[PDB]
């Protein structure tokens, strides 16, 4: 088969600047009809892919003309000029020269913005959940940048290990931030045996770790 390679898994770019996404093929995608059968696609989270560039350098109908494609027969560049925050997504190359058609592994576009520390909130388990025998404690880190953020849980000043799970949102298409939730799961009985629940957040925007806590029963 023809192997498509995308050497960078992500490229960062500040809105208004231009950015290049690279792809390579293991065989020339040139056809005797003169066209190079390299295609570029965008996929936004939760959506179907959409074509940007057809036959290496041609702008697909309706795509903004700040997208352009160029290449040799074996190395290709999607150039996105005047990047907008809404350009977050994954960009794939694909060859249509020979069966089986094959895709590159994808390159995310990461929008750069001003560093922003998270706003941190902590939620005790609801009494409704406690009635069922389990307690979930939730720490929300809201609207931060960059993506990297570490959460450590402490119960009665003892660092927790093994009992949390985190989820991160996709980079926001308007404000370019992320949000993160960390959920600490313990039994109802253990929740009621301890008093102080704390989530400690480390992030580039913070000069020292930030802690949010509550005291059970208060």
């Amino acid at each position: 088969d023809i192997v498509m390679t995308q050497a960078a898994p992500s490229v960062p770019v500040t809105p208004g600047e231009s950015v290049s996404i690279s792809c390579r093929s293991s065989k020339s995608l040139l056809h005797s009809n003169g066209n190079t059968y390299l295609f570029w696609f965008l996929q936004r989270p939760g959506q179907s892919p959409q074509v940007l560039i057809y036959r290496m350098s041609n702008l697909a109908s309706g795509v903004p003309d700040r997208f352009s494609g160029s290449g040799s027969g074996t190395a290709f560049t999607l150039r996105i000029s005047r990047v907008e925050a809404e350009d977050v997504g994954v960009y794939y190359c694909m060859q249509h020269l020979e069966y089986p058609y094959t895709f590159g592994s994808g390159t995310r576009l990461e929008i750069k913005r001003t560093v922003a520390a998270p706003s941190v909130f902590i939620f005790p388990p609801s009494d409704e959940q406690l009635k069922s025998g389990t307690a979930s404690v939730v720490c929300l880190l809201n609207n931060f940048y960059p993506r990297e953020a570490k959460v450590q849980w402490k119960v009665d000043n003892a660092l927790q290990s093994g009992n949390s799970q985190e989820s991160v949102t996709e980079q926001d298409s308007k404000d370019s931030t992320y949000s993160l939730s960390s959920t600490l799961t313990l039994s109802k009985a253990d929740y009621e045996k301890h008093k102080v629940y704390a989530c400690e957040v480390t992030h580039q925007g913070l000069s020292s770790p930030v802690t949010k806590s509550f005291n059970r029963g208060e």
Partner: protein, 210 residues
């Protein structure tokens, strides 16, 4: 307008077969190829194969030759893909697309599992700079997905519905949060609308300040 309308999500047991459809409209169905694409959760795109609905001819990626069968029904302008001997590796979104990749279907989620469907419990995350955060915890459901809206869709600004996590129990959980003016906590009802279609579960949970 050209449209490719794919069939709904499938929860199917391992070792069985599933047949998904792609109904074309807005153009001469027999004059264009239909291609099929697999996307495992959080992963990239993989090309399955292509059918010419006019001639019935097909080409398959060798990796899908045994797994997949592509057919087309000229009378209903529908393309079909059957997957046989299903395993967990086949759990993915499957797309159809018209040749060249301008027009795509919306995708069909296929989940292969022997596990039983289970509806979620929904618990409030009560509110306690002038901004309050509140939310809903949607716990212990299977399979994906759950969708969340706030105030029947009237509240979208400041909402974050997190990707679900697979818990060590084998059940999924997610949370959905929203930030609002603290001054609104006494005057505005906040309800999270939770939909878990696989179990036909709908919960509209009011989130009260504590």
């Amino acid at each position: 307008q050209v449209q490719l309308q794919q069939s709904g999500a499938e929860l199917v047991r391992p070792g069985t077969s599933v047949k998904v459809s792609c109904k074309a409209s807005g153009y001469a169905f027999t004059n264009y190829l239909i291609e099929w694409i697999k996307q495992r959760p959080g992963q990239g795109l993989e090309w399955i194969g292509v059918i010419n609905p006019g001639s019935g001819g097909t080409n398959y990626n060798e990796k899908f030759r045994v797994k997949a069968t592509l057919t087309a029904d000229k009378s209903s302008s529908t393309a079909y893909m059957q997957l046989s001997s299903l395993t967990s590796d086949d759990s993915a979104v499957y797309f159809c697309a018209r040749g060249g990749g301008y027009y795509w279907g919306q995708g069909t989620l296929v989940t292969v599992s022997a596990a039983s469907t289970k509806g979620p419990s929904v618990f409030p995350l009560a509110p306690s700079g002038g901004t309050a955060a509140l939310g809903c915890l949607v716990k212990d459901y299977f399979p994906e997905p759950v969708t969340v809206s706030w105030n029947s869709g009237a509240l979208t600004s400041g909402v974050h519905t997190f990707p679900a996590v697979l818990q060590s129990s084998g059940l999924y959980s997610l949370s959905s949060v929203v930030t609002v003016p603290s001054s609104s906590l006494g005057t505005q009802t906040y309800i999270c609308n939770v939909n878990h279609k696989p179990s036909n579960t709908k919960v509209d949970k009011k989130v009260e300040p504590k």
